Amino acid sequence: VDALPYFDQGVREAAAALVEEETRRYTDIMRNEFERLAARQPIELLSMKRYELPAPSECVNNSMAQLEHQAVRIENLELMSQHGCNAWKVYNENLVHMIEHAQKELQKLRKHIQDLNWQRKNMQLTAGSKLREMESNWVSLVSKNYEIERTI
């Protein structure tokens, strides 16, 4: 389990091969049906391509459609121009309040992420010393046991 990241400054391709060798050894209605079919087939359902073209001299209806929607259009452009750019820049201000809130959370996550790594670092340096202490003592016995036997 234990593998010191901060302390071990000195194999991935080697260990990958040894891990590889142990791997060599071992809810909606109709809506969902047409939606998944439209995405799978990559085809959007065709809309009413009629109102825009039409023709002078069935078309009596198509003509009368163009008038009422054009009058609704010209009324729909009047109430926009009345306010004008005030209604747009009022929504632009809302988008700046929405944006800054996200980047505050980017910082809060940034701080606690570096704070967790900061605690780990001390632990790595604590034990890495203790392992260094153990290995020095290990090498001392290794030669001590020899020099005892050489003299006997």
Partner: protein, 33 residues
Amino acid sequence: ELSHALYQHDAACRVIARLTKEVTAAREALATL
């Protein structure tokens, strides 16, 4: 689960790299002795 695994996998992978080199050191040491 994917992130915690991949991190802990390559973490557990470094256990082997360490373990392999120590195992190797035990061989030439004992062999030459």
